[PDB]
Amino acid sequence: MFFIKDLSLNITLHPSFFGPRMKQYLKTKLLEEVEGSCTGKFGYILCVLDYDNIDIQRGRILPTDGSAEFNVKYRAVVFKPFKGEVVDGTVVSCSQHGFEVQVGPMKVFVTKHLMPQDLTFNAGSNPPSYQSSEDVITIKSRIRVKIEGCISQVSSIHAIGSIKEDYLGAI
Amino acid sequence: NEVSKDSIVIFDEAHNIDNVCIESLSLDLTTDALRRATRGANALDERISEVRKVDSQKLQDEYEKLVQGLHSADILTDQEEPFVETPVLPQDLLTEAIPGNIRRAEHFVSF
Amino acid sequence: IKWKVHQVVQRLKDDLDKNSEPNGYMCPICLTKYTQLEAVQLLNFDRTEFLCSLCDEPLVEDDSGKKNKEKQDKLNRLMDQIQPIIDSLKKIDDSR
Amino acid sequence: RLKKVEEEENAATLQLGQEFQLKQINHQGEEEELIALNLSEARLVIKEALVERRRAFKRSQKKETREKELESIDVLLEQTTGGNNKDLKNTMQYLTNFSRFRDQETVGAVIQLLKSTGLHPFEVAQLGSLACDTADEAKTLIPSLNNKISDDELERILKELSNLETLY
Numbered sequence A: 001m002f003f004i005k006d007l008s009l010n011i012t013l014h015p016s017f018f019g020p021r022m023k024q025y026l027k028t029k030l031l032e033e034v035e036g037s038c039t040g041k042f043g044y045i046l047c048v049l050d051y052d053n054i055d056i057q058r059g060r061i062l063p064t065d066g067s068a069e070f071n072v073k074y075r076a077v078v079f080k081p082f083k084g085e086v087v088d089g090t091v092v093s094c095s096q097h098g099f100e101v102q103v104g105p106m107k108v109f110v111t112k113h114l115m116p117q118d119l120t121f122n123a124g125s126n127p128p129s130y131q132s133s134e135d136v137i138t139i140k141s142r143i144r145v146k147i148e149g150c151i152s153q154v155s156s157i158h159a160i161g162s163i164k165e166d167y168l169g170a171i
Numbered sequence B: 001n002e003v004s005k006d007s008i009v010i011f012d013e014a015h016n017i018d019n020v021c022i023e024s025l026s027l028d029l030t031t032d033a034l035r036r037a038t039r040g041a042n043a044l045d046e047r048i049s050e051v052r053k054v055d056s057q058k059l060q061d062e063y064e065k066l067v068q069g070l071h072s073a074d075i076l077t078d079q080e081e082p083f084v085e086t087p088v089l090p091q092d093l094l095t096e097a098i099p100g101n102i103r104r105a106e107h108f109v110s111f
Numbered sequence C: 001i002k003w004k005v006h007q008v009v010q011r012l013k014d015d016l017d018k019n020s021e022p023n024g025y026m027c028p029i030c031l032t033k034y035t036q037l038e039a040v041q042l043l044n045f046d047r048t049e050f051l052c053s054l055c056d057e058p059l060v061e062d063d064s065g066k067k068n069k070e071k072q073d074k075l076n077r078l079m080d081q082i083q084p085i086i087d088s089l090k091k092i093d094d095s096r
Numbered sequence D: 001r002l003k004k005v006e007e008e009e010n011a012a013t014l015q016l017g018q019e020f021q022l023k024q025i026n027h028q029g030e031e032e033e034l035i036a037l038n039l040s041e042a043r044l045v046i047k048e049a050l051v052e053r054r055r056a057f058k059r060s061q062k063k064e065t066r067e068k069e070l071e072s073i074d075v076l077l078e079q080t081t082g083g084n085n086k087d088l089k090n091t092m093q094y095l096t097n098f099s100r101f102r103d104q105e106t107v108g109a110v111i112q113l114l115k116s117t118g119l120h121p122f123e124v125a126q127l128g129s130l131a132c133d134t135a136d137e138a139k140t141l142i143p144s145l146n147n148k149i150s151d152d153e154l155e156r157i158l159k160e161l162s163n164l165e166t167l168y
Helices: A023-032 B017-024 B031-054 B057-068 B105-110 C002-020 C036-041 C067-094 D039-062 D066-080 D086-098 D104-117 D121-129 D135-141 D143-148 D151-162
Strands: A002-013 A044-049 A059-061 A068-079 A086-095 A098-102 A143-149 A160-162 C025-027 C032-034
Touching: A002 A023, A023 A068, A044 D039, A044 D086, A068 D039, A098 A143, A160 C036, B031 B057, B031 B105, B057 B105, C002 C067, C025 C036, D039 D066, D039 D086, D039 D104, D039 D121, D066 D086, D104 D121, D104 D151, D121 D143, D135 D143, D135 D151
Parallel strands: none
Antiparallel strands: A002 A068, A044 A068, A059 A068, A086 A098, A086 A143, A143 A160, C025 C032
């Protein structure tokens, strides 16, 4: 789930951008290298908070290059993909051995073993629908999936899930 | 249960009966007993898992009987005896329903 | 004896637990196994199959799902065979 | 340093992770409690940040209706930022799809209630991000909540939250 915290960043600036008006220039750079980004420690980084009164105020020239290093402190919103509780995600694409649920930003997959064996899956569906009563995979496809575990790696986020529980898959 | 209230009661040579009174409500805990409790709880848990796998009807029947809040005298007959005998005096017993937090068999095992 | 039987029991129990998991994949060109998650990160753009990183080979699924019940039965019958040892161990623990 | 394994699951029996725990310290030295958020609260504050930064850029070159709002903040986003935020489009679609209150005032009243209750922050944020009106069914959904809260108190809060929030 989404989180708010003060966070620090680490940014180089090329010496060509040493013009008289660089503070808002750095603010712009902070925008398109914070918004729309993913990591492992903080997950998907959504958007920034506290646009005014931001904390840069000082920078060091790197020794071997005219790049100037800056340290940026900022409030923001990220996403923290947890494990072990229910989300009602949506499914866009599917595979032969399970559907791939897109609960917001990431794409969580459920293996054909992680679906319950008494789920009456029919392979002759477009997309292959693992439905028993109501959880037919559609364009909407609100499926209550529980994240198994969102396995953290280098900055490309992946998760696993299952529906082997009452009202899991069922809304 | 089967004694007349207005009988005649006599006691003889119970001048050290306070010790019996003390041990009536005193208890000790040892490490090996804790180990046996862990092993028994694991055995009961795996038995409950097996029973839930093969026939959950008896477990669901027990669970709904606890939802109605029946007790040992309510369910058990005379020819069957309670396993855990009533440790406390009957004047101080609880007679209301089992909470839902321990009502399920798995809930009570985890408890 | 107790340590060896405990190790055997834990080994085979974790074998059954691991064999209850999805089998995984491998690339037979490099003869290297691949997990289900490693298949997930190695998919094609078609979101259908999985291609190897080095050999660029379509991932073929591991064969252990039928082996799950076989390892379960081997565990069961091995416990049945080892059961007199378990009973003697119980009587030994009764003794000093 | 000792390679410091520290295996930990995230749940609602105060089973919280280290990396985002409760008591931090902010950079000026003041104590930084954890900020967990509701889905409708996030739905409000993304709009608040968007209108704030949009008016900030209005000063820069000078010197709740969801169907309009998602596409409007989208075109505001590709006014300056890039179009790569398809997942961020998915996120505010998720927010407007399942956030328990469309309007700001119900969320504000709920938070005004919770600032007096003093409940557990991540617990009540998970409850607020969830969109349900059935306490016992929620306890069956999450056995962590089933173990933590009494169903009577859960429903006595859930109904006085449920009458306020916009039902779906």
